[PDB]
Design a protein around this ligand. Structure first.
Ligand SMILES: *[C@@H]1O[C@H](CO)[C@@H](O[C@H]2O[C@H](CO)[C@@H](O[C@@H]3O[C@H](CO)[C@@H](O)[C@H](O)[C@@H]3O)[C@H](O)[C@H]2NC(C)=O)[C@H](O)[C@H]1NC(C)=O
Ligand SMILES: *[C@@H]1O[C@H](CO)[C@@H](O[C@H]2O[C@H](CO)[C@@H](O[C@@H]3O[C@H](CO)[C@@H](O)[C@H](O)[C@@H]3O)[C@H](O)[C@H]2NC(C)=O)[C@H](O)[C@H]1NC(C)=O
Lengths: 93, 93
């Protein structure tokens, strides 16, 4: 199970009220993709087999949105999970 | 996707230092099973297709172990998630 990689856009000068996109890149298999913040699961979503990535887009609405983002993915046939992606940091303001 | 159900043993007179088992009952399909505490993911693990349940057994090590436990399960073929189980409350002492 290949380690996913995570990108953040925008990554510089992000402020409250801005919308950010965390794009989790993984293989073209159907999978449940998770976004983790500070070592705790924040969001998950389905990624159809044909997609190259799952994207988590959200508004920055408070100071606790800052921190260390990672992504992980899982399949049930076989019963496998990836390791966490290398981290990407959301720094506010 | 049938809603899972969760049991807790022991459920009465539980104290710090005791070991509890949260047993998540679901169908005989291979699946990733999650244990959630107070609406945030705590643990996950694989459940082999032949198992009737995934069990999360852990020691009660602090007061923050108390609260509302639920379980959820997911498969990637098809890309489906259950709803949360009805809640079971761990009450300490
Ligand atoms: C993920 O970890 C982040 C990095 O530690 C953490 O970042 C921030 O969280 C706290 C809580 O909001 C901020 O501290 C507050 O700052 C305000 C303004 O000064 C104070 O009024 C308040 O009392 C408190 O000190 C930190 O400034 C901030 N740190 C950084 C680098 O942005 C996230 O909260 C955390 N997110 C989670 C766990 O969901
Ligand atoms: C999941 O929700 C639980 C129910 O709200 C929560 O329960 C408990 O959490 C707090 C934090 O430890 C306890 O309050 C503390 O009590 C000690 C002893 O009096 C104080 O010294 C301390 O300052 C603080 O008030 C609550 O007593 C307790 N409530 C119950 C019903 O057990 C869990 O913390 C929470 N678990 C999570 C989010 O991981």
């Amino acid at each position: 199970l290949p380690q996913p990689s995570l990108s953040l856009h925008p990554s510089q000068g992000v402020s409250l009220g801005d919308t950010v996109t965390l794009r989790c890149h993984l293989p073209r298999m159907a999978a449940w993709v998770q976004l983790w913040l500070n070592g705790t699961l924040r969001f998950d979503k389905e990624k159809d087999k044909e997609q190259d990535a799952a994207e988590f887009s959200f508004a920055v609405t408070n100071l606790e949105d800052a921190g260390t983002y990672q992504c992980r993915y899982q399949v049930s046939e076989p019963l496998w999970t990836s390791n966490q992606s290398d981290p990407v940091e959301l720094v506010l303001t």
